[PDB]
Symmetry: C4
């Protein structure tokens, strides 16, 4: 019976079908948003999710036996598997349902062309780790400082290695960094800009290089 | 009578005179802006609009007879047709009068060099369709996620897949995303930062490669 | 006697000396910022300023005769010339902003200096390959600045009361600065579909902005 | 004794050990961030800091005698030297050195190699920019000067001093709340103020671009 089921999972019919449910549950998950709607046909819908999830589980279960050890070294179906397993994680923390919406990323898994444009991006990740690790330590060394400078008067923003990491990141984005965060800060600590215009130059400079680093390909 | 209009239509003056009329009315419509202007000379103007509106029909009719099928596979001319039809609709939704202003774009269509710099731009879109579509899926899988997260206390921003799409887009543009959206939210949802800091990395990450792609895809 | 003064103007030191005065006027203009400075040394200071402008007119005049028809074919010296002439114009006859643009003669630093003359000149050469684009933008702006004004100028005169205000506001949206909270979401209170206007504009104007650089790393 | 400390300094483990200890106090200082932590094992900590502060003194003294002048031509070792002396300077009587004590966590880049590199790569890009930077600085200067004696009158918070102007300009340069926050206000009082800031913005933005392509060209 082994060679029987082998024909099912990868038929032209199957993949398009899994894809189909994906776009469907994709849609279906997009409708499960409307409140007007659910009072009319809400039940009609909710079933289909488990359906897709079960099929996607069947798909995910089938995809398992035929490949055996082969299924468990691929990002995509494991993705789907999580995406399915997440989506399989029973209907009641509640985000699995939500990450169940990632099962609409199974669209990325079940559909070609998507798989490619995705993998093309990642190939760039390796050349940046040198830079990223720098950033995280860089942010961290600063997450330590901001906290023990500005946590005095500004506990919302720099009270915590957490909040300082947050607020710093926001300044990195240059979002309300001045009017929203620094000009306030400078009211209490007249010399704060010596921390931030540099933080801004530095992190501004670095981020750029990472890109030139990218345009190495 | 066939071969008559073809030399007119394909004449240097034709190209140059159509272009002439455009620049005329482009000015004219920047004038239809002043209220100061219209209660005095509204008459003189509105007419010239119906005037220009008419000639360009001839041109399009002439260019139609002259190219026949050659015209309606011409983006530049196809555009022309549409951007013409809009302005002809009678004088009273009132937005059409306004869309009547789009007619200043045939200036891109009718003038050489313009057809070209634009075509250069559009031609890049094919290398992007893959990404946009991913984004759109990404945004959607996420506007879905955000909406089935934040619409209770924050119906203004995330009440609808729409405002979520919008807000996400707004967050995407990075305009007031933290002080304005994440920090309020965090007044109520302390770990909201785990949703938006990643969406921000990803939606940003993706946008990046896309540009080196352009500079690299050449 | 012509070649006498001619050899002088083009001396290594002359070049070295004009460059010098620029930096002087550069600084002296920088201390007239402090009221402390002036209430002590308003006398001491203001006097020193007429000195340089005349000299810079002199250089400009010398550079004129020594070069004749050639001087007013020199941007830098013309710059200088105006920058000097700008800097030359009297202290009260009209509007009072002229005293200041003399500070552009501190751009004469860019004019008198060789390595600076260059880096500045390096930037400019990029322009020929882009003119194609800016003009499209400029047009693009015009076509949109027009629409917004006769759309949102009824209710939003601060931002869109005038084709001017619209250009401004459109420009602001372009930078994505407070574009949503500050402008689009407001608009949307009265005109609910405005996002259909701006998301594309934001889509398009941003797009155009991108291609223009690849063109640069192409030139 | 000359040769005794030499194998230690350039040994794999010493390198790994200093490197190791770095990760320790780094964690330790990251815990010196938590107010929570300091009252239980702060002793364990504040002490361990002198522990770390003392051990690391050995290393630099070792590396110095071992390298003598070879030490003070190593940017990387010089930093090591500089960033240590700071951590040694006492607890009283402006209090920020204590805070600067946290910079000794950058030695993780120095003692470790591929970090020494990524740093040098970024730095290497900088020289092709001095021509630019200097212009900026001059440009800013010619412009920061102009602004202060204009708007320090009605808007002294932003432009009362050549300094606040520099700050505000860089803020305008970074484009944060530059419009709603600064120019539109200015225009309520100085109707034509808008003529100054769009140019600084084009230019200073312009300059910044070349600097990238200048970089992406280098
Ligand atoms: C990664 C940085 C280390 C880090 O995340 O520290 C933890 C904080 C905690 O934030 P917190 O606001 O305290 O909320 C969590 C509550 N808690 C601690 C009890 C769990 O987590 C944060 O809130 C950090 C939020 C800012 C995001 C980090 C952005 C910088 C990462 C470096 C990469 C960016 C440059 C490439
Ligand atoms: C190439 C990089 C160049 C940039 C690095 C320059 C290094 C020089 C930094 C000197 C800092 C000046 C002294 C200072 O700001 O005191 C720190 C104050 C303490 O608060 P307070 O004692 O109230 O003043 O706290 C503050 O106000 C600021 C925190
Ligand atoms: C609504 C559900 C529609 C299904 C998804 C869809 O519209 O297409 C997105 C992906 C593939 O993207 P696709 O548009 O087929 O990219 C192909 C572009 N080309 C011709 C240059 C190779 O499929
Ligand atoms: C472009 C079309 C994208 C699209 O279809 O999204 C539709 C939603 C629905 O808007 P709508 O139903 O009118 O309600 C929105 C609420 N309002 C009035 C406050 C804006 O409207 C929006 O999404 C509003 C914001 C437009 C964002 C467009 C999303 C494109 C993301 C994927 C491509 C971006 C990366 C290339
Ligand atoms: C920057 C420091 C600053 O702006 O404030 C210092 C004082 C303010 O006066 P004030 O606070 O009223 O006096 C106390 O104002 C000053 O002291 C500003 C002095 C301006 C120094 C200009 C630097 C000269 C470099 C020349 C390069 C240009 C020629 C090529
Ligand atoms: C150049 C446009 C000149 C023009 O006709 O109007 C100038 C407007 C200001 O007019 P106005 O209404 O008098 O402004 C007074 C101050 N306000 C806003 C409070 C009333 O102010 C502006 O137009 C400033 C916006 C200029 C942006 C020009 C963009 C054209 C090219 C697109 C940029 C990309 C190039 C690649
Ligand atoms: C870094 C350059 C530092 C500089 O040029 O002057 C620093 C000024 C000092 O002004 P000061 O009045 O002494 O203190 C301002 C503090 N405030 C705002 C609370 C009154 O304070 C600042 O505003 C610092 C902002 C300077 C950033 C622009 C200078 C960089 C050159 C242009 C960008 C380089 C091209 C990559
Ligand atoms: C070469 C490319 C870069 C170019 C950079 C050159 C910079 C040129 C732009 C500067 C123009 C902006 C100046 C401005 O708008 O304000 C000046 C006047 C103020 O008139 P007003 O409205 O009467 O206010 C009274 C002024 N007060 C109290 C200080 C005596 O407002 C006016 O009425 C001046 C009329 C213009
Ligand atoms: C004055 C009138 C109430 C009386 C209100 C109520 C309904 C409105 C129209 C429609 O909403 C759609 C249309 C969309 C375009 O984006 C811009 C203009 C449009 C907005 C509006 C014109 C008009 O101003 C209307 C505001």
């Amino acid at each position: 019976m082994y060679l029987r089921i082998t024909n099912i999972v990868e038929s032209s019919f199957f993949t398009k079908f899994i894809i189909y449910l994906i776009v469907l549950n994709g849609i279906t998950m997009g409708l499960e948003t409307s409140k007007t709607f659910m009072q009319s046909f809400g039940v009609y819908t909710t079933l289909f999710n488990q359906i897709v999830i079960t099929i996607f589980t069947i798909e995910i279960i089938l995809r398992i036996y035929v490949h055996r050890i082969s299924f468990f070294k691929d990002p995509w179906s494991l993705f789907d598997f999580f995406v399915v397993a997440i989506s399989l994680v029973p209907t009641s923390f509640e985000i699995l349902r939500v990450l169940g919406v990632l099962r609409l990323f199974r669209l990325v898994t079940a559909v070609p062309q998507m798989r490619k444009i995705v993998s093309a991006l990642i190939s760039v990740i390796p050349g940046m780790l040198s830079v990223i690790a720098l950033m995280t330590l860089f942010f961290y060394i600063f997450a330590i400082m901001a906290t023990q400078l500005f946590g005095e008067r500004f506990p919302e923003w720099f009270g915590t290695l957490g909040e300082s990491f947050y607020t710093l990141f926001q300044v990195m984005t240059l979002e309300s960094w001045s009017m929203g965060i620094v000009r306030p800060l400078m009211e209490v600590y007249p010399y704060a800009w010596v921390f931030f215009i540099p933080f801004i130059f530095v992190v501004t400079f670095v981020m750029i290089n990472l890109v030139v680093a990218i345009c190495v390909d």
